[PDB]
Short mmCIF file of the C-alpha atoms (twelve columns), coordinates in Angstrom:
data_MODEL
# 
_entry.id   MODEL 
# 
loop_
_atom_site.group_PDB 
_atom_site.id 
_atom_site.type_symbol 
_atom_site.label_atom_id 
_atom_site.label_alt_id 
_atom_site.label_comp_id 
_atom_site.label_asym_id 
_atom_site.label_seq_id 
_atom_site.Cartn_x 
_atom_site.Cartn_y 
_atom_site.Cartn_z 
_atom_site.pdbx_PDB_model_num 
ATOM 1   C CA . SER A 1   22.630 -62.356 -19.409 1 
ATOM 2   C CA . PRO A 2   25.744 -58.954 -19.945 1 
ATOM 3   C CA . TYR A 3   22.663 -56.464 -19.789 1 
ATOM 4   C CA . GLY A 4   20.106 -58.721 -18.496 1 
ATOM 5   C CA . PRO A 5   17.518 -58.402 -15.301 1 
ATOM 6   C CA . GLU A 6   20.053 -60.274 -12.959 1 
ATOM 7   C CA . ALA A 7   23.683 -58.317 -14.185 1 
ATOM 8   C CA . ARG A 8   20.704 -55.159 -13.581 1 
ATOM 9   C CA . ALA A 9   19.428 -55.904 -10.638 1 
ATOM 10  C CA . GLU A 10  23.108 -56.128 -8.903  1 
ATOM 11  C CA . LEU A 11  24.038 -52.755 -10.200 1 
ATOM 12  C CA . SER A 12  21.388 -51.641 -8.394  1 
ATOM 13  C CA . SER A 13  21.823 -52.838 -5.273  1 
ATOM 14  C CA . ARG A 14  25.597 -52.681 -5.875  1 
ATOM 15  C CA . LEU A 15  24.932 -48.550 -6.771  1 
ATOM 16  C CA . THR A 16  21.452 -48.441 -4.094  1 
ATOM 17  C CA . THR A 17  24.716 -49.954 -0.852  1 
ATOM 18  C CA . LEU A 18  26.512 -46.549 -2.170  1 
ATOM 19  C CA . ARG A 19  24.165 -43.923 -2.436  1 
ATOM 20  C CA . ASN A 20  22.542 -44.784 0.985   1 
ATOM 21  C CA . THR A 21  26.926 -45.186 1.759   1 
ATOM 22  C CA . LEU A 22  26.813 -41.430 0.687   1 
ATOM 23  C CA . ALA A 23  24.130 -40.016 2.464   1 
ATOM 24  C CA . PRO A 24  25.444 -36.257 4.156   1 
ATOM 25  C CA . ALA A 25  25.410 -36.475 7.564   1 
ATOM 26  C CA . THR A 26  24.981 -33.218 9.757   1 
ATOM 27  C CA . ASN A 27  27.905 -31.391 9.413   1 
ATOM 28  C CA . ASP A 28  29.685 -33.640 7.192   1 
ATOM 29  C CA . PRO A 29  33.508 -33.782 6.720   1 
ATOM 30  C CA . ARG A 30  32.582 -35.109 2.861   1 
ATOM 31  C CA . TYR A 31  30.948 -32.307 1.723   1 
ATOM 32  C CA . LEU A 32  31.365 -28.443 1.089   1 
ATOM 33  C CA . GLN A 33  29.648 -26.385 4.826   1 
ATOM 34  C CA . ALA A 34  27.806 -23.172 3.880   1 
ATOM 35  C CA . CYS A 35  29.932 -20.135 6.018   1 
ATOM 36  C CA . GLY A 36  27.880 -18.547 7.918   1 
ATOM 37  C CA . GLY A 37  24.421 -18.278 6.616   1 
ATOM 38  C CA . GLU A 38  24.703 -17.832 2.881   1 
ATOM 39  C CA . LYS A 39  22.949 -20.412 1.972   1 
ATOM 40  C CA . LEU A 40  24.988 -23.545 -0.412  1 
ATOM 41  C CA . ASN A 41  23.108 -26.142 -1.500  1 
ATOM 42  C CA . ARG A 42  20.269 -25.109 -3.494  1 
ATOM 43  C CA . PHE A 43  18.328 -28.892 -2.087  1 
ATOM 44  C CA . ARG A 44  19.602 -29.332 1.495   1 
ATOM 45  C CA . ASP A 45  19.828 -32.920 1.757   1 
ATOM 46  C CA . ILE A 46  21.666 -32.684 -2.726  1 
ATOM 47  C CA . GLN A 47  25.560 -31.527 -1.568  1 
ATOM 48  C CA . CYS A 48  28.597 -31.147 -2.821  1 
ATOM 49  C CA . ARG A 49  31.421 -33.311 -1.996  1 
ATOM 50  C CA . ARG A 50  34.555 -31.215 -0.561  1 
ATOM 51  C CA . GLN A 51  37.943 -33.360 -2.187  1 
ATOM 52  C CA . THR A 52  36.319 -32.121 -5.466  1 
ATOM 53  C CA . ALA A 53  34.662 -28.853 -5.014  1 
ATOM 54  C CA . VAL A 54  35.696 -25.868 -7.273  1 
ATOM 55  C CA . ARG A 55  35.081 -23.116 -5.197  1 
ATOM 56  C CA . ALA A 56  33.925 -22.443 -1.567  1 
ATOM 57  C CA . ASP A 57  30.683 -21.194 -2.521  1 
ATOM 58  C CA . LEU A 58  29.335 -22.963 -4.434  1 
ATOM 59  C CA . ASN A 59  28.591 -26.652 -5.305  1 
ATOM 60  C CA . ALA A 60  29.905 -27.354 -8.020  1 
ATOM 61  C CA . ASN A 61  32.342 -30.541 -8.382  1 
ATOM 62  C CA . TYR A 62  35.399 -31.278 -10.575 1 
ATOM 63  C CA . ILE A 63  34.585 -34.681 -12.636 1 
ATOM 64  C CA . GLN A 64  36.839 -37.477 -13.964 1 
ATOM 65  C CA . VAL A 65  34.870 -40.730 -15.054 1 
ATOM 66  C CA . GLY A 66  38.096 -42.423 -16.220 1 
ATOM 67  C CA . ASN A 67  39.770 -40.463 -18.447 1 
ATOM 68  C CA . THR A 68  36.922 -37.675 -19.347 1 
ATOM 69  C CA . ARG A 69  37.424 -34.149 -16.878 1 
ATOM 70  C CA . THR A 70  34.438 -32.258 -16.225 1 
ATOM 71  C CA . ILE A 71  32.223 -29.687 -13.978 1 
ATOM 72  C CA . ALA A 72  29.404 -30.702 -12.506 1 
ATOM 73  C CA . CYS A 73  27.471 -28.083 -10.480 1 
ATOM 74  C CA . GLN A 74  24.301 -27.157 -9.225  1 
ATOM 75  C CA . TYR A 75  22.308 -24.456 -11.000 1 
ATOM 76  C CA . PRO A 76  23.741 -21.559 -9.059  1 
ATOM 77  C CA . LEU A 77  20.924 -19.523 -6.985  1 
ATOM 78  C CA . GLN A 78  21.099 -15.527 -7.230  1 
ATOM 79  C CA . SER A 79  23.738 -15.238 -4.807  1 
ATOM 80  C CA . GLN A 80  25.962 -17.782 -6.446  1 
ATOM 81  C CA . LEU A 81  26.308 -16.176 -9.634  1 
ATOM 82  C CA . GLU A 82  29.634 -13.777 -9.569  1 
ATOM 83  C CA . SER A 83  31.076 -16.715 -7.716  1 
ATOM 84  C CA . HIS A 84  29.687 -18.936 -11.024 1 
ATOM 85  C CA . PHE A 85  30.746 -16.143 -13.608 1 
ATOM 86  C CA . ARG A 86  34.430 -16.505 -12.073 1 
ATOM 87  C CA . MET A 87  34.415 -20.221 -12.560 1 
ATOM 88  C CA . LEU A 88  33.084 -20.155 -15.189 1 
ATOM 89  C CA . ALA A 89  36.113 -17.668 -16.508 1 
ATOM 90  C CA . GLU A 90  38.525 -18.723 -14.860 1 
ATOM 91  C CA . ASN A 91  38.009 -22.448 -16.004 1 
ATOM 92  C CA . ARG A 92  38.454 -21.026 -19.951 1 
ATOM 93  C CA . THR A 93  35.093 -23.381 -19.821 1 
ATOM 94  C CA . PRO A 94  34.904 -24.667 -23.200 1 
ATOM 95  C CA . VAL A 95  31.198 -25.124 -23.200 1 
ATOM 96  C CA . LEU A 96  28.834 -25.039 -20.293 1 
ATOM 97  C CA . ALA A 97  26.053 -27.048 -21.123 1 
ATOM 98  C CA . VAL A 98  22.394 -25.762 -18.847 1 
ATOM 99  C CA . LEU A 99  19.324 -29.092 -19.183 1 
ATOM 100 C CA . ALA A 100 17.122 -27.084 -16.609 1 
ATOM 101 C CA . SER A 101 14.326 -26.468 -19.199 1 
ATOM 102 C CA . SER A 102 12.991 -22.900 -19.840 1 
ATOM 103 C CA . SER A 103 9.828  -23.702 -17.841 1 
ATOM 104 C CA . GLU A 104 11.888 -23.993 -14.614 1 
ATOM 105 C CA . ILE A 105 13.962 -21.038 -15.422 1 
ATOM 106 C CA . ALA A 106 10.593 -19.311 -15.836 1 
ATOM 107 C CA . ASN A 107 9.062  -20.774 -12.608 1 
ATOM 108 C CA . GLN A 108 10.241 -17.636 -10.259 1 
ATOM 109 C CA . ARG A 109 8.868  -19.834 -7.205  1 
ATOM 110 C CA . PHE A 110 12.545 -22.590 -8.881  1 
ATOM 111 C CA . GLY A 111 14.222 -19.211 -7.974  1 
ATOM 112 C CA . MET A 112 16.787 -20.161 -10.544 1 
ATOM 113 C CA . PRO A 113 17.464 -16.770 -12.147 1 
ATOM 114 C CA . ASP A 114 18.033 -16.584 -16.098 1 
ATOM 115 C CA . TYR A 115 22.050 -15.748 -16.288 1 
ATOM 116 C CA . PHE A 116 22.857 -16.993 -19.754 1 
ATOM 117 C CA . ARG A 117 19.810 -15.867 -22.088 1 
ATOM 118 C CA . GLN A 118 20.168 -12.258 -20.529 1 
ATOM 119 C CA . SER A 119 22.931 -9.633  -20.500 1 
ATOM 120 C CA . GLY A 120 23.744 -8.394  -16.804 1 
ATOM 121 C CA . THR A 121 25.563 -7.075  -14.271 1 
ATOM 122 C CA . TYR A 122 27.554 -9.458  -11.622 1 
ATOM 123 C CA . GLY A 123 29.585 -7.858  -8.761  1 
ATOM 124 C CA . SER A 124 32.115 -6.899  -10.820 1 
ATOM 125 C CA . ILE A 125 31.059 -9.426  -13.103 1 
ATOM 126 C CA . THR A 126 29.280 -8.008  -16.876 1 
ATOM 127 C CA . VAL A 127 28.107 -10.782 -18.770 1 
ATOM 128 C CA . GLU A 128 26.784 -9.593  -22.649 1 
ATOM 129 C CA . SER A 129 24.625 -13.324 -23.750 1 
ATOM 130 C CA . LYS A 130 23.882 -13.372 -27.997 1 
ATOM 131 C CA . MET A 131 22.147 -16.251 -28.732 1 
ATOM 132 C CA . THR A 132 23.319 -18.024 -31.823 1 
ATOM 133 C CA . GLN A 133 22.149 -21.523 -33.767 1 
ATOM 134 C CA . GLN A 134 19.019 -23.300 -32.620 1 
ATOM 135 C CA . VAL A 135 19.788 -27.338 -33.041 1 
ATOM 136 C CA . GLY A 136 17.172 -30.207 -32.853 1 
ATOM 137 C CA . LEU A 137 18.460 -33.196 -31.344 1 
ATOM 138 C CA . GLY A 138 15.690 -35.643 -32.138 1 
ATOM 139 C CA . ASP A 139 12.172 -36.476 -29.976 1 
ATOM 140 C CA . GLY A 140 11.001 -33.121 -30.646 1 
ATOM 141 C CA . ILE A 141 14.149 -32.025 -27.743 1 
ATOM 142 C CA . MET A 142 15.837 -28.848 -28.838 1 
ATOM 143 C CA . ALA A 143 18.941 -27.242 -28.318 1 
ATOM 144 C CA . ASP A 144 19.073 -23.088 -27.910 1 
ATOM 145 C CA . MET A 145 23.249 -21.918 -27.905 1 
ATOM 146 C CA . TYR A 146 24.165 -18.527 -26.460 1 
ATOM 147 C CA . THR A 147 27.810 -16.854 -26.419 1 
ATOM 148 C CA . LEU A 148 28.527 -15.636 -23.108 1 
ATOM 149 C CA . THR A 149 30.636 -12.704 -22.753 1 
ATOM 150 C CA . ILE A 150 32.143 -12.476 -18.994 1 
ATOM 151 C CA . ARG A 151 33.775 -9.289  -18.963 1 
ATOM 152 C CA . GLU A 152 35.661 -7.461  -15.555 1 
ATOM 153 C CA . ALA A 153 37.625 -4.183  -14.932 1 
ATOM 154 C CA . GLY A 154 41.531 -5.515  -15.106 1 
ATOM 155 C CA . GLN A 155 40.579 -9.914  -16.091 1 
ATOM 156 C CA . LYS A 156 40.789 -11.057 -19.252 1 
ATOM 157 C CA . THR A 157 37.271 -11.453 -21.032 1 
ATOM 158 C CA . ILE A 158 36.298 -14.582 -21.888 1 
ATOM 159 C CA . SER A 159 32.977 -16.636 -24.048 1 
ATOM 160 C CA . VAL A 160 31.840 -19.094 -22.637 1 
ATOM 161 C CA . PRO A 161 29.421 -21.243 -25.790 1 
ATOM 162 C CA . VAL A 162 26.532 -22.574 -24.444 1 
ATOM 163 C CA . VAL A 163 24.222 -25.420 -25.118 1 
ATOM 164 C CA . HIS A 164 20.528 -24.532 -23.674 1 
ATOM 165 C CA . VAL A 165 18.399 -27.833 -23.729 1 
ATOM 166 C CA . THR A 166 15.596 -26.354 -23.449 1 
ATOM 167 C CA . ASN A 167 12.769 -28.686 -22.935 1 
ATOM 168 C CA . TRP A 168 14.426 -32.231 -20.630 1 
ATOM 169 C CA . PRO A 169 11.877 -32.129 -17.903 1 
ATOM 170 C CA . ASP A 170 13.307 -32.885 -14.312 1 
ATOM 171 C CA . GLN A 171 13.180 -36.203 -13.114 1 
ATOM 172 C CA . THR A 172 13.261 -38.225 -16.747 1 
ATOM 173 C CA . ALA A 173 15.353 -39.471 -19.389 1 
ATOM 174 C CA . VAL A 174 15.481 -38.483 -22.448 1 
ATOM 175 C CA . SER A 175 16.261 -41.325 -25.148 1 
ATOM 176 C CA . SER A 176 19.669 -42.968 -25.949 1 
ATOM 177 C CA . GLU A 177 19.741 -41.554 -29.342 1 
ATOM 178 C CA . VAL A 178 18.612 -37.905 -28.325 1 
ATOM 179 C CA . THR A 179 21.748 -38.342 -25.441 1 
ATOM 180 C CA . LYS A 180 24.230 -39.720 -27.489 1 
ATOM 181 C CA . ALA A 181 22.879 -36.487 -30.068 1 
ATOM 182 C CA . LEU A 182 23.708 -33.760 -27.235 1 
ATOM 183 C CA . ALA A 183 26.517 -35.629 -26.573 1 
ATOM 184 C CA . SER A 184 28.067 -35.030 -29.687 1 
ATOM 185 C CA . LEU A 185 26.662 -31.285 -29.079 1 
ATOM 186 C CA . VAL A 186 28.671 -30.683 -26.792 1 
ATOM 187 C CA . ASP A 187 31.718 -31.986 -27.062 1 
ATOM 188 C CA . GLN A 188 31.801 -31.071 -30.273 1 
ATOM 189 C CA . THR A 189 31.343 -27.152 -29.232 1 
ATOM 190 C CA . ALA A 190 33.910 -27.609 -26.969 1 
ATOM 191 C CA . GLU A 191 36.599 -29.193 -28.711 1 
ATOM 192 C CA . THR A 192 36.236 -25.613 -31.385 1 
ATOM 193 C CA . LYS A 193 36.782 -23.606 -28.459 1 
ATOM 194 C CA . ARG A 194 39.881 -25.497 -27.562 1 
ATOM 195 C CA . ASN A 195 41.090 -25.421 -30.424 1 
ATOM 196 C CA . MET A 196 40.634 -21.179 -31.038 1 
ATOM 197 C CA . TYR A 197 42.763 -21.281 -27.622 1 
ATOM 198 C CA . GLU A 198 45.281 -24.205 -28.882 1 
ATOM 199 C CA . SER A 199 45.498 -21.794 -31.928 1 
ATOM 200 C CA . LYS A 200 46.454 -18.582 -29.907 1 
ATOM 201 C CA . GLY A 201 49.236 -20.697 -27.606 1 
ATOM 202 C CA . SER A 202 46.533 -20.703 -24.500 1 
ATOM 203 C CA . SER A 203 48.791 -22.154 -21.895 1 
ATOM 204 C CA . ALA A 204 45.318 -23.158 -20.222 1 
ATOM 205 C CA . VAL A 205 45.119 -25.904 -23.227 1 
ATOM 206 C CA . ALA A 206 47.987 -28.277 -20.810 1 
ATOM 207 C CA . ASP A 207 46.661 -27.410 -17.550 1 
ATOM 208 C CA . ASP A 208 43.979 -30.579 -16.442 1 
ATOM 209 C CA . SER A 209 41.517 -28.376 -14.280 1 
ATOM 210 C CA . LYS A 210 41.249 -25.718 -17.259 1 
ATOM 211 C CA . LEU A 211 38.611 -26.364 -20.309 1 
ATOM 212 C CA . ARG A 212 36.300 -28.228 -18.761 1 
ATOM 213 C CA . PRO A 213 32.760 -28.490 -20.230 1 
ATOM 214 C CA . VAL A 214 30.726 -26.935 -16.976 1 
ATOM 215 C CA . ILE A 215 26.760 -28.788 -16.829 1 
ATOM 216 C CA . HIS A 216 24.140 -28.886 -14.798 1 
ATOM 217 C CA . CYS A 217 20.517 -28.600 -14.289 1 
ATOM 218 C CA . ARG A 218 18.602 -28.365 -11.501 1 
ATOM 219 C CA . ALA A 219 19.885 -29.902 -8.765  1 
ATOM 220 C CA . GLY A 220 22.928 -31.412 -10.960 1 
ATOM 221 C CA . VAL A 221 22.577 -34.412 -10.656 1 
ATOM 222 C CA . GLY A 222 19.978 -36.254 -12.676 1 
ATOM 223 C CA . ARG A 223 19.724 -35.058 -16.094 1 
ATOM 224 C CA . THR A 224 23.494 -33.672 -15.630 1 
ATOM 225 C CA . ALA A 225 24.748 -37.202 -14.439 1 
ATOM 226 C CA . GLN A 226 22.677 -38.963 -17.495 1 
ATOM 227 C CA . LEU A 227 25.295 -36.342 -19.626 1 
ATOM 228 C CA . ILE A 228 28.443 -37.099 -18.207 1 
ATOM 229 C CA . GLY A 229 27.805 -40.487 -18.714 1 
ATOM 230 C CA . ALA A 230 27.092 -40.134 -22.311 1 
ATOM 231 C CA . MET A 231 30.175 -37.744 -23.218 1 
ATOM 232 C CA . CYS A 232 31.916 -40.440 -20.992 1 
ATOM 233 C CA . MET A 233 30.589 -43.634 -23.938 1 
ATOM 234 C CA . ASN A 234 31.948 -40.964 -26.040 1 
ATOM 235 C CA . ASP A 235 35.632 -40.995 -25.241 1 
ATOM 236 C CA . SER A 236 37.349 -43.533 -27.008 1 
ATOM 237 C CA . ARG A 237 40.231 -43.653 -23.898 1 
ATOM 238 C CA . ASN A 238 37.386 -44.969 -21.894 1 
ATOM 239 C CA . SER A 239 37.325 -48.179 -22.990 1 
ATOM 240 C CA . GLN A 240 36.186 -51.520 -20.739 1 
ATOM 241 C CA . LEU A 241 35.197 -48.595 -18.157 1 
ATOM 242 C CA . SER A 242 32.171 -50.500 -16.865 1 
ATOM 243 C CA . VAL A 243 28.723 -49.099 -15.588 1 
ATOM 244 C CA . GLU A 244 29.446 -49.075 -12.274 1 
ATOM 245 C CA . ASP A 245 32.150 -47.486 -11.960 1 
ATOM 246 C CA . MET A 246 31.453 -44.576 -14.720 1 
ATOM 247 C CA . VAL A 247 28.375 -43.723 -11.793 1 
ATOM 248 C CA . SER A 248 30.676 -44.251 -8.635  1 
ATOM 249 C CA . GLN A 249 32.952 -42.716 -9.214  1 
ATOM 250 C CA . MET A 250 30.343 -39.445 -10.221 1 
ATOM 251 C CA . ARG A 251 28.825 -40.479 -6.632  1 
ATOM 252 C CA . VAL A 252 32.350 -39.996 -5.387  1 
ATOM 253 C CA . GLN A 253 33.093 -37.100 -6.692  1 
ATOM 254 C CA . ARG A 254 30.109 -35.005 -6.272  1 
ATOM 255 C CA . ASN A 255 26.854 -36.801 -4.748  1 
ATOM 256 C CA . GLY A 256 25.307 -40.253 -3.736  1 
ATOM 257 C CA . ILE A 257 22.525 -39.101 -5.807  1 
ATOM 258 C CA . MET A 258 24.574 -38.570 -9.140  1 
ATOM 259 C CA . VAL A 259 21.996 -40.508 -11.596 1 
ATOM 260 C CA . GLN A 260 18.827 -40.132 -9.639  1 
ATOM 261 C CA . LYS A 261 16.443 -41.607 -11.713 1 
ATOM 262 C CA . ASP A 262 16.016 -45.413 -12.357 1 
ATOM 263 C CA . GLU A 263 15.310 -44.483 -16.175 1 
ATOM 264 C CA . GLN A 264 18.244 -42.295 -16.179 1 
ATOM 265 C CA . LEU A 265 21.214 -45.090 -14.955 1 
ATOM 266 C CA . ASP A 266 18.621 -47.645 -17.873 1 
ATOM 267 C CA . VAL A 267 19.521 -45.270 -20.347 1 
ATOM 268 C CA . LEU A 268 23.214 -45.372 -19.221 1 
ATOM 269 C CA . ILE A 269 22.369 -48.916 -19.408 1 
ATOM 270 C CA . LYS A 270 21.883 -49.218 -22.980 1 
ATOM 271 C CA . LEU A 271 24.329 -46.775 -24.315 1 
ATOM 272 C CA . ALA A 272 27.037 -49.915 -22.333 1 
ATOM 273 C CA . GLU A 273 25.374 -52.346 -24.350 1 
ATOM 274 C CA . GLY A 274 24.739 -50.861 -27.984 1 
ATOM 275 C CA . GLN A 275 29.269 -50.599 -27.269 1 
ATOM 276 C CA . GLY A 276 29.494 -54.111 -25.273 1 
ATOM 277 C CA . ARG A 277 30.665 -52.351 -22.100 1 
ATOM 278 C CA . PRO A 278 30.583 -54.179 -19.312 1 
ATOM 279 C CA . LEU A 279 28.052 -53.234 -16.260 1 
ATOM 280 C CA . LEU A 280 29.104 -54.895 -13.550 1 
ATOM 281 C CA . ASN A 281 33.369 -55.272 -12.340 1 
ATOM 282 C CA . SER A 282 35.042 -58.356 -12.081 1 
# 
C-alpha cells in the first residue's frame, strides 16, 4: 500500500506535473542561456538551471538532495572541454563518474569527445589519463577506473579518480542491485580522495561548493539521476527524505527531465522500499 500502485500513480502524477512546468520556454529566465553563438546545451530541450549552474559556459549544476552534494552535468561538448577540466580541478573533484557507454563515446555522430581515456591538451590545460583497476558491478555491468592528472601553467596540479561504467545503455535502468553497488564504489572512491586532501590539511574540505562528486552520462538526466538518487539514499543523514522530494529537488536544481525513464524511477522506488523510505510527502 505505501509502495502499491495507487501510491506509485500518485508519485507519477506529481512528478509529471513538475516535469511539464519546468519545460524550458524560449529565453527562459530559469535556465542558463548560451552566449554569442557557442552551443551550450548538448540537447536543445535539456537545459541547465541558472540558480545552480557551476560555470557560465557549461551545462552543469550543483545538486543538493537532502544533505548529499554533487554536480550533475551533460557530457561536455568538444568546445567545452577546457572549461570542463577547469570545473573538475577547481572542485578538487573526489570522483568523476562517467555513465556514458564505450559504444556511445566511440560513435562519432554523437560528438562525445574521449576526454578521460586519452591524454590530451585543451587550451592551456594538459590532461594525462592513466587506467587503473577494473571492477564488475553485477549483471555484466563493468566499470573502468582512471586517474586524470589536470595540469596548467601556474595552476595547482589536480588528479581526479574516474569511474567509467562502460555498458549502461542509454534510456535504461540498470538493476537496483547494480545501482547500489555503483553508488558504493563511487562513494568509496570519493571518500578515499577526500581523505587524501584532508590528510594534507586541504582547506577545500570545509567548502560546501567543493569536493563534490561529478556525474554525467550523455545528457546528464537519465542514468546520472538514477545514480544520484541512489547516492542520496546511501547517505544516512538523509533519513525520511521521500522519493517525491529527492526527484523534485533534482528537477528544480537541474531540469524537469531528471529521472528520464519510468524504469529509472522504478529502481529508485525499489531502493526506497527496501529502506522503508517514503514515496510521497505527508
